[PDB]
């Protein structure tokens, strides 16, 4: 048993981008100003299209942003679980899509931010403010620290918030992707890809202080990360390069432990995983495993070269990874992958080099893990069900009675709605948690966690896996402020 893929799909643009849209799940995905190209002046507009998981289906192409090239943008989802990108091709453009109005309709523009910029990384702080930096992909001036505040739709520079001591010794853009974390009282940890981590505090004019080396590891550009237990503090990190391109991608694997913030970050090292990747995506799963997906070894852009297309699984609880199935298709530059509410995981996209260019994929699958499978790994397991929240619209701290359909053991976790491109994806983040039997087995309580740097604010899917281990299809449910 090491899962199975589905069935292959292929969108009218290159899914260089994709989000999961809260309480449908849909997928929505994402190129350019072009379906099949990209410029880095861009094109005033993104080409967008959906997948349906309710009817399995595609919708074809439509100009749904008619302002903003989302080209090379920073990502995130806020309390409410809109979509907010900046920059990229429209370097200083902010745009955001309410799902609620429809996932097909026009995103909507927000303010410009006060830097130009794109390939920054964005996250959500713990009060729900959005909190950009870096990206030299586009844009002008020292690509400093900046803030959103979407009650108030502005923008504010954090002086005391510099990319300085994030940027990279070489390469392009040395000073993008950064691996951000958001934590307790308004903190982000800048965990990487430099080798020389480093606090944020997005609060008043701002703050940073070091948080320590990332133990041995060498400069990691577009390695990834993934904040697999939010409660204990973990997050872990594989690969990447000492450049954006230029040289072999590591299949070094760490565990950084956070406390408090400003304080150093604890890293341990574990053996190394079998191939090494630059350009992958890492997806945590509801059991707290991470699935690792693509990436190249000499790290090029729009090429097919040494491809890893064999992806690995790892477990924290055993510092161990397992291969999973190969797929056929490189996912090296401009892939993307992400978990679904059905527990499945999406892997596909690559390229956007123009037309009749053969480093173009429009085409993905989902990737359905073990717990999926009864133990001879190629039957479908049987799934619990939640029929109802008590609540969907909890505070931090607060009780969220889930009633189950059928009656047994089960165990919880809730994982923070996510979008991802170019490897960064802050969204994605995984709380497990302990469910209190309300008498019958099927009616269960947990408590979201009492710090929202732990629960950052907006859209989680909550799941239940049953004693097999086989996970429900998430109920969605919002942490506000
Ligand atoms: C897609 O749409 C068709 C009708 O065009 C519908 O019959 C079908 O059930 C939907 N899903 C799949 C997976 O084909
Ligand atoms: C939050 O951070 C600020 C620094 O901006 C600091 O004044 C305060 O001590 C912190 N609050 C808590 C509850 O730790
Ligand atoms: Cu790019």
């Avoid at 994982?415 to 802050?426: D, E, F, L, W």
Wanted: net charge neutral; with cysteine.
């Amino acid at each position: 048993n090491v899962g199975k893929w589905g069935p292959m799909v292929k969108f009218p643009v290159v899914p260089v981008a994709v989000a999961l849209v809260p309480e449908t799940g849909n997928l929505l995905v994402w190129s350019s100003g072009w379906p099949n190209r990209w410029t880095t002046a861009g094109n005033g507009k993104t080409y967008t299209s959906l997948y349906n998981v309710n009817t399995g289906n595609i919708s074809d192409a439509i100009v749904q942003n008619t302002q903003h090239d989302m080209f090379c943008p920073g990502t995130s989802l806020d309390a409410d679980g809109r979509i907010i990108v900046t920059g990229g091709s429209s370097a200083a453009k902010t745009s955001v899509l309410d799902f609620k109005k429809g996932e097909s309709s026009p995103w909507t523009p927000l303010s410009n931010m006060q830097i130009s910029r794109g390939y920054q990384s964005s996250c959500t702080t713990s009060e729900g403010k959005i909190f950009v930096i870096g990206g030299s992909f586009s844009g002008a001036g020292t690509r400093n620290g900046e803030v959103y505040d979407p009650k108030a739709n502005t923008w504010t520079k954090l002086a005391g918030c510099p990319v300085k001591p994030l940027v990279m010794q070489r390469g392009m853009f040395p000073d993008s992707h950064a691996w951000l974390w958001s934590w307790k009282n308004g903190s982000v940890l800048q965990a990487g890809p430099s080798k020389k981590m480093n606090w944020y505090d997005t609060k008043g004019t701002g703050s940073n202080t070091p948080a320590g080396l990332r133990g041995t590891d060498e400069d990691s550009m577009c390695g990834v990360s993934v904040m697999y237990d939010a409660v204990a503090g973990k997050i872990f990190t594989y690969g990447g390069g000492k450049g954006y391109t230029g040289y072999d991608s590591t299949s070094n694997a760490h565990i950084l432990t956070l406390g408090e913030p400003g304080q150093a970050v604890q890293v341990q090292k574990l053996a190394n995983g079998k191939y090494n990747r630059g350009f992958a995506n890492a997806v945590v799963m509801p059991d707290g495993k991470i699935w690792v997906v693509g990436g190249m070894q000499k790290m090029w852009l729009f090429s097919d070269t040494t491809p890893q297309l064999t992806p690995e699984l790892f477990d924290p609880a055993t510092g161990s990874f397992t291969p999973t199935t190969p797929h056929t298709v490189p996912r090296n530059y401009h892939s993307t992958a992400l978990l679904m509410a059905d527990a499945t995981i999406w892997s596909g996209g690559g390229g956007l080099c123009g037309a009749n260019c053969k480093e173009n994929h429009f085409d993905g699958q989902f990737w359905s893990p073990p717990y999926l499978f009864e133990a001879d790994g190629v039957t479908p397991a049987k799934r619990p069900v939640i029929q109802s929240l008590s609540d969907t619209a909890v505070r931090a701290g607060a009780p969220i009675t889930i009633t189950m359909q059928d009656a047994g053991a089960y165990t919880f976790s809730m994982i923070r709605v996510s979008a991802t491109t170019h490897t960064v994806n802050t969204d994605q983040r995984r709380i497990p948690l302990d469910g209190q039997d309300g008498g019958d087995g099927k009616s269960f309580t947990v408590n979201v966690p009492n710090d929202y740097g732990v629960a950052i604010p907006g859209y989680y899917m909550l799941f239940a896996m049953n004693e097999a281990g086989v996970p429900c299809v998430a109920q969605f449910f919002k942490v506000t402020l």
